[model samples]
Target chain A: NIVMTQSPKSMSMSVGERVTLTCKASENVVTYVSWYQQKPEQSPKLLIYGASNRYTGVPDRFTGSGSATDFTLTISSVQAEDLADYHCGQGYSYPYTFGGGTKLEIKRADAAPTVSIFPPSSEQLTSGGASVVCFLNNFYPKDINVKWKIDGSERQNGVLNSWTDQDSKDSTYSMSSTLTLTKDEYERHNSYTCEATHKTSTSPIVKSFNRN
Target chain B: DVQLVESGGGLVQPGGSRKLSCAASGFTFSSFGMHWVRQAPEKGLEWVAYISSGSSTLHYADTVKGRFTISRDNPKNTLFLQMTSLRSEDTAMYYCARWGNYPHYAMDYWGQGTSVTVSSAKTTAPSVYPLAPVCDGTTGSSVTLGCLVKGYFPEPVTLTWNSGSLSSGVHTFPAVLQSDLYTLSSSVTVTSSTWPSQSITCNVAHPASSTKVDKKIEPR
Candidate 1:
């Protein structure tokens, strides 16, 4: 029976992007490791080593997800470019390397921005065209991109809000991007994905637009 | 030593824009943050927006994140919540509070709420019904009749119990507020023996109501 936790909870990202995958052990993790192995006869290993593989050159795995006590690292399920400059703390051990990633979509993972969505306008109801808005707030790393998937197909339009303020004083920002669909493409009830991509995450902060 | 007041238009059309203002007096504002909270029909309280007094940092609830913006005027010590693309779901009662950051950030002193309905003219009446009147006590000692009414609004209703023998005048409890409407309870003390035989009626009335509603109860 062990316990663990993480903060700032959830985050958003795009495929090929990178975010922190940092994992920590608890109970001071003093007596036993929070990454793995608590029983007798176990070993510890560093897959990617330190932050960026001690600031790395190659990602050993692409398959890690979740908290301090329990999680994974998907070595093959990821892409090549996705593996470049990536972080991994697990190489795999019969005993236990106990290493987890922190540079690839880990914690704070560069600190995720908040995601928000709005319903279609009533006027858009009649015209069969509307602007379903997605707002990302209080984020870091300015080079953000937007991708649209209509029912999973990239057959749509996304207009990024240019005024996403980069608080010149603080390293935080906010943006409001509107997805517009023509009369034929838009439906009163349908789902679309607003993929917010940043190099800070291995996955996009994908928000579904189940708008009406 | 601070007071806040909510002022805004009553019926904002769907798809239109709305602006609600809160004025603070009696204390040095701009010295403290203010937050806007709303309770929509049938829903509990919702955090709409928050504005830091000095830093001017602002944030919106996911409910109105993009369509709404919060700001404040320092000289007037007033705060504002401006909403665009208003919809029917936006109808609610809005309140403002001085922010507190003790055991965690929370609203301390609150202002009286102002109601907003985003639709056509607000001339519609509220749904009202009478709960079964209850009689309690032994046959001869003393009896009490309680009539309860629920779901009426735009104004509180007067609930009255009438027609009985050897009974006290109808006394009612303060109307209770629920989901933006009202619920009421009224009663009269009567001789237990006469309670069953005397035909009595429970009546309710409100300004928004075109006519009074009543229910007659007779038991043997």
Candidate 2:
């Protein structure tokens, strides 16, 4: 099976604003890539073919254009119907493969919230006991990092967290993350925080939490 | 507007055999290719294969290989399919279809399905049941006649009903199983009300290369 990777983890865009999602294959699959849009309760409908030709009944506003390993699914005018997870499938062979979906959230400029406290809150717990959880809300495409601090010292053996965009509702996409800690390090005061930064800015929003 | 007039029921004992048929009408048989598909009870559609009118060429899908054959005679514009090795699983509805591939790509037309059941053949000697001759009635009242055959296995046959008096609606019924050793029953029905005689004849048409059996009927 061919492996597929998607980038930026997640993104948020305003209505009428153009958003592009990218999917790259592990190796050259010729042009056997097809795109599908999967909504909550319905079967996935075939959207683009041969990397470009839209399926017979697909709407005209949606277009697929790309070549070789790099391809894009563009919604000309993002509508509520277009606010679902988009996935790419390789039709070149059996045991077909699909990419982790890219979720697009529609944001309204007037309703955008101010970035305060820089980063949100984070905590760490033992593995066999309860695991630590982190919540990063109201953030989009902004680089965020969460780390574990053990006994006032940063623990280097912990894992790095990734972002997952929840299903879009009404047009906006919600993102969240969760982290787990090792059991032997339970009693010490474990600290964790999320750092948010963007390409256009220099300073980062760093939030921390300590669990006794 | 094409239609399929099929044969009736049959009884073949376990290890005994039979053959089935479906005759088509309404369109020039040569214009399109005929496809045979089998649908096991409660199962999805299986593509058996297709037969062309001119060359009598038969094509079988992988799943149907070694079990079925398709052939036709142009003089009669009739096509025939046979499947051998009778088994309980073979009981299902078989349909004959015409493919219009060139201008329109999909299966644009179909025939009413013919249902076949495989069961134990009763030991009683085989007999024939014939129906009365049709009456040539005015537009309002009409007569109906039918011919039924029993206990024949895997034989290629044709059926026709005719009265000595006038031209009545004539149809041919094919067997349901198309194999070398399966039992089948075929029946033909004619409707009219003005009859010069009270009886008609049901003829069992054997393949041109073989012998055939025939039966006659009087008003019942």
lDDT by residue for model 1 over B65-155, one digit each (tens)?
Answer: 8898888888878888898999888888887877642323334456777777676433434332222222222444554444545445544
lDDT of 1 by residue, A26-57 (tens): 32222222221111111111232212221123
Model 1 alpha-carbon drift over 4 Å, by segment: A1-212, B9-13, B101-106, B119-122, B126-220
Model 2: per-residue lDDT, tens digit, A83-195? Answer: 66677756554334567666566654322212211111111121133233333333434445444444445554533233433324333222223233444444444555545
Off by over 4 Å in 2: A1-14, A18-34, A40-43, A49-57, A64-73, A84-130, A159-162, A170-179, A182-184, A190-212, B1-220
DockQ computed for model 2 against the true two-chain complex using alpha carbons: 0.01
- Give the C-alpha lDDT of model 2: 0.50
- Looking at model 1 chain B, report the run of 10 residues with the lowest lDDT sum: B128-137
DockQ of each model against the real complex? 0.01, 0.01
Give the winner by TM-score: 1
Interface RMSDs of all predictions? 24.8, 30.4
